[PDB]
C-alpha cells in the first residue's frame, strides 16, 4: 500500500464489521465492489415497454407534446414482453454464458437490461448500453409483429426519441443513470452527471446508503478526472472513507450524539472535540480567550471535517425532514468551523463555495431548482471535489415530501428498475465486505 492509514468499517446500523482495514481497500482503483458498481452503472438500462407501446398507439414520439397523426400503430408489446425480451437478450448478449441480464418488471411493463461487460472491454465509453439495448428492442418488436419496412421507423422513434436530430435521446422510452457523453462539463465527468434524485431513487431513500453511493460515484470520478492523483490521492480516499463510508463510525456517532436536540453548531463542537481526542488537531497558539488550532495532517483534518459536515446535514435536514436546508448546512458548517478553529473548512473552502451558489440556485429565479436535480456535473455543484453532493443525497433522502421535483417526478423509471440491483440499493454493505476481503491483499 502507498499509505499507512487503516480504518474501522461499520454497517448502516452502526455496527463494527471489520477492524483496521488499509485505506486503499476502499479505493475505487482496488475495491472489487466499487469496480462492480461502476461497471453496473455503465451497462444497465431501463426499458419502458408500456411507454413504448403507448407512444406507438398514439404516435406521440419525438419529444414533449409531439405527435404525428396517421402514424399510429397498435402493437401489444406488454402482452408479448417475454418473447420480445428473450429475442432482444439474444442480440444484446455476446455468448450464452456471459453476464447479460434481461429481467421483466411490472408484469412486462418495464425491463431491467444489463449489457454484457465484454462489449465495454472493446468500447471507448458507455453509450453501448443504451444504443445496443435500444436497437435490440427495436428489432425484437419489429420481428415480434413483422412490422413493415414502411412503419418500422416509428418503433425506432418510440424507443430512442428524436435522436439523431436532437443530440439527446429526446422523448426516448429508455433510461440510464448516466447522461450522454456530449453533456459532460469536462472530460472524466461522466460519473458526476448522475442526478442526486437518481441516487436517492436507487437507494430507496436510505440516508446512509444514499450517502455512500453518491460518495462512491463522486470520488471515483475524482480518479477519472485525475484529481485523486499524486499529492491529492490520500485526501480523496480519506474523504471517501470518513464522509461516505462511515469509517470509524464517526458520522454515525456524531448523528447519535446530536439527533435528539442537536444543531449544526453542536455537531461542530463535538467534531472539534473528537479531532483533539484523536490527535488530529492540537492547539497551535492562543490569542485573547481564543485558541488557534493547527494540524500536521490536513488531509485527515479535512476527512474528520467531511464526516462532521455529513453528520450536520443529517441532523439539520433530518430534524426538518426537508432537504432544502442542506445548501445552508453545507455553507455555515464550514463557515462556522473555520472561525471556531482557525483551520480551513472542508475541501479548503470549495464546499463553502459550492454551498453559496447552491443556495442561490435553489432559492432564486435564475436557474437550478430543488436539491434533487443537482449533481456533480451541474455547473452549480461541480466545484467541490466530492465533498458536497453526497450531503445533498443524504438530505433528499431525509425529505418527507416537501419537494415538487422529487425522485418520483424526475427518476420514477430509475426508482423502479435500478433499485432492483442489490449493489446499487445497498452499496455500503458491498464495498465494506469487499474491503474486508482484500484487507490483506493491499
Amino acid at each position: 500500500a502507498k499509505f499507512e492509514d487503516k480504518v474501522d468499517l461499520y454497517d448502516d446500523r452502526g455496527n463494527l464489521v471489520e477492524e483496521q482495514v488499509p485505506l486503499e481497500a476502499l479505493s475505487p482503483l482496488r475495491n472489487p465492489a466499487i469496480k462492480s458498481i461502476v461497471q453496473g452503472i455503465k451497462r444497465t438500462v431501463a426499458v419502458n415497454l408500456e411507454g413504448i407501446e403507448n407512444a406507438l398507439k398514439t404516435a406521440k414520439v419525438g419529444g414533449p407534446a409531439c405527435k404525428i397523426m396517421g402514424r399510429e400503430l397498435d402493437l401489444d408489446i406488454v402482452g408479448n414482453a417475454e418473447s420480445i425480451a428473450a429475442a432482444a437478450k439474444e442480440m444484446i448478449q455476446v455468448t450464452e454464458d456471459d453476464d447479460t441480464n434481461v429481467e421483466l418488471l411490472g408484469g412486462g411493463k418495464r425491463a431491467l437490461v444489463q449489457v454484457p461487460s465484454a462489449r465495454f472491454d472493446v468500447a471507448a465509453e458507455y453509450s453501448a448500453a443504451p444504443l445496443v439495448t435500444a436497437t435490440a428492442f427495436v428489432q425484437a418488436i419489429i420481428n415480434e409483429f413483422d412490422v413493415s419496412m414502411y412503419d418500422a421507423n416509428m418503433v425506432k422513434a418510440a424507443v430512442l426519441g428524436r435522436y439523431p436530430q436532437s443530440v439527446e435521446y429526446m422523448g426516448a422510452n429508455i433510461a440510464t443513470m448516466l447522461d450522454i457523453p456530449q453533456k459532460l462539463e469536462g472530460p472524466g465527468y461522466a460519473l458526476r452527471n448522475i442526478m442526486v434524485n437518481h441516487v436517492v431513487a436507487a437507494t430507496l431513500k436510505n440516508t446512509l446508503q444514499a450517502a455512500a453511493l453518491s460518495t462512491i460515484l463522486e470520488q471515483t470520478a475524482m480518479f477519472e478526472m485525475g484529481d485523486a492523483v499524486g499529492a491529492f490521492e490520500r485526501m480523496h480516499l480519506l474523504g471517501l472513507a470518513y464522509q461516505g463510508m462511515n469509517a470509524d463510525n464517526l458520522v454515525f456517532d456524531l448523528v447519535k450524539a446530536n439527533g435528539k436536540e442537536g444543531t449544526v453548531g453542536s455537531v461542530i463542537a463535538d467534531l472539534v472535540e473528537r479531532a483533539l481526542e484523536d490527535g488530529v488537531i492540537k492547539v497551535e497558539k492562543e490569542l485573547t480567550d481564543y485558541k488557534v488550532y493547527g494540524t500536521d495532517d490536513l488531509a485527515m483534518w479535512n476527512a474528520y471535517a467531511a464526516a462532521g459536515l455529513m453528520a450536520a446535514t443529517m441532523v439539520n435536514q433530518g430534524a426538518a425532514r426537508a432537504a432544502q436546508g442542506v445548501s445552508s448546512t453545507l455553507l455555515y458548517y464550514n463557515d462556522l468551523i473555520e472561525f471556531e478553529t482557525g483551520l480551513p473548512s472542508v475541501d479548503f473552502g470549495k464546499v463553502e463555495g459550492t454551498a453559496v451558489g447552491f443556495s442561490f440556485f435553489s432559492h432564486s429565479i435564475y436557474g437550478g431548482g430543488g436539491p434533487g436535480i443537482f449533481n456533480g456535473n451541474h455547473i452549480v455543484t461541480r466545484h467541490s471535489k466530492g465533498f458536497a453532493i453526497p450531503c445533498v443525497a443524504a438530505a433528499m433522502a431525509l425529505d418527507a415530501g416537501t419537494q415538487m421535483f422529487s425522485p418520483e417526478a424526475t427518476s420514477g423509471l430509475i426508482k423502479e428498475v435500478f433499485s432492483q440491483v442489490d449493489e446499487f440499493r445497498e452499496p455500503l454493505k458491498y464495498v465494506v465486505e469487499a474491503a474486508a476481503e482484500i484487507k490483506n491483499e493491499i
Binding site: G259, G265, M314, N316, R321, G325, D335, E340, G342, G401
Partner: protein, 248 residues
C-alpha cells in the same frame, strides 16, 4: 465553543449571538397572534396547511439516521416550509446578515438560513418558524428602527436614515409615531395591510445600538483595529491557498 475571535464589543456580541448558552436580552413582549399576523402565511387561528401527510401517518423507511434524528414538531405535522426575513441597517443595527445565519444554525434545529447584503432569511416548518420568529422579534436580534421584517422590496440596509432615524422601507411596513416615540408595524412582511397594527416598542438609543451592534465601522469599532480577528481571517486565507496547491 469559541465561535469567533476578537477583543472588541462587536466580536463578543457575535460570540453571544451564536452561543446557545447566552440568553438573548428580551426587549419587548409580542402576542402569538401578532407573530402570525407579522408572518402573513396564515390567519390567526387558521389551520396549519400541510405540504405532506403527518410523519406518523406515513411509514418512513427503516433508516438508522431517521430513527436517531428527532423531527421538529412542524415536520411531524407535515407543515409547509415558510419564512421570516430581516433587513439590518449598516448604521449599527444589533444583528447583521452573516451573524444571523451563523447564530441560527447554532441555536435552531432544521433551519434553512440564507445570507445576502440587504436581506437574511430562514425557512423551516411553519409552526416551528413562529416560535423562532417570536424570539427573533422579541430579543436583541431586532430593533424596530434599524431592522425590518421584509419578504420583498428589502432596499434599505445601505441607505441613509430618515429624519426619525428609521431605516428606509419602499413599502413602509414599520411606522415611527413622532407623537409617541414608538414604532408600529402597519403592514405584514410581504407588504399587505394589517387590520390592527403591532406595537414594536421604542427604538434603541444610539449609545445602546453601539453597545449591541455586530457590524464593524470606523465610527464605531473598526474591523482593522480588531487585529486578532483580522489575523484569523488572513490565516484562513493562507491555509486555504496552501491546501489548494499542496505541492510545497
Amino acid at each position: 465553543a469559541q465561535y469567533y475571535p476578537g477583543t472588541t464589543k462587536v466580536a463578543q456580541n457575535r460570540r453571544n449571538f451564536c452561543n446557545p448558552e447566552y440568553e438573548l436580552e428580551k426587549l419587548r413582549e409580542i402576542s402569538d397572534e401578532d407573530v402570525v399576523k407579522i408572518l402573513g402565511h396564515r390567519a390567526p387561528g387558521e389551520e396549519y396547511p400541510s405540504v405532506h401527510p403527518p410523519l406518523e401517518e406515513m411509514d418512513e423507511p427503516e433508516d438508522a439516521i431517521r430513527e436517531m434524528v428527532e423531527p421538529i414538531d412542524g415536520a411531524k405535522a407535515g407543515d409547509r416550509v415558510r419564512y421570516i426575513q430581516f433587513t439590518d441597517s449598516m448604521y449599527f443595527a444589533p444583528a447583521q446578515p452573516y451573524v444571523r445565519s451563523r447564530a441560527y444554525l447554532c441555536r435552531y434545529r432544521g433551519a434553512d438560513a440564507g445570507t445576502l447584503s440587504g436581506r437574511q432569511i430562514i425557512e423551516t416548518r411553519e409552526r416551528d418558524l413562529e416560535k423562532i420568529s417570536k424570539e427573533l422579534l422579541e430579543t436583541e436580534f431586532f430593533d424596530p428602527a434599524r431592522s425590518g421584517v421584509r419578504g420583498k422590496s428589502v432596499h434599505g440596509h445601505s441607505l441613509r436614515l430618515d429624519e426619525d432615524g428609521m431605516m428606509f422601507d419602499m413599502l413602509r411596513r414599520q411606522i415611527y409615531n413622532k407623537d409617541t416615540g414608538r414604532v408600529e408595524m402597519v403592514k405584514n412582511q410581504i407588504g399587505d395591510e394589517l387590520d390592527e397594527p403591532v406595537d414594536l416598542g421604542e427604538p434603541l438609543d444610539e449609545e445602546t445600538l453601539m453597545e449591541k451592534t455586530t457590524i464593524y465601522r470606523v465610527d464605531g469599532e473598526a474591523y482593522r483595529d480588531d487585529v486578532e480577528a483580522v489575523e484569523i481571517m488572513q490565516r484562513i486565507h493562507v491555509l486555504r491557498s496552501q491546501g489548494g496547491f499542496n505541492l510545497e
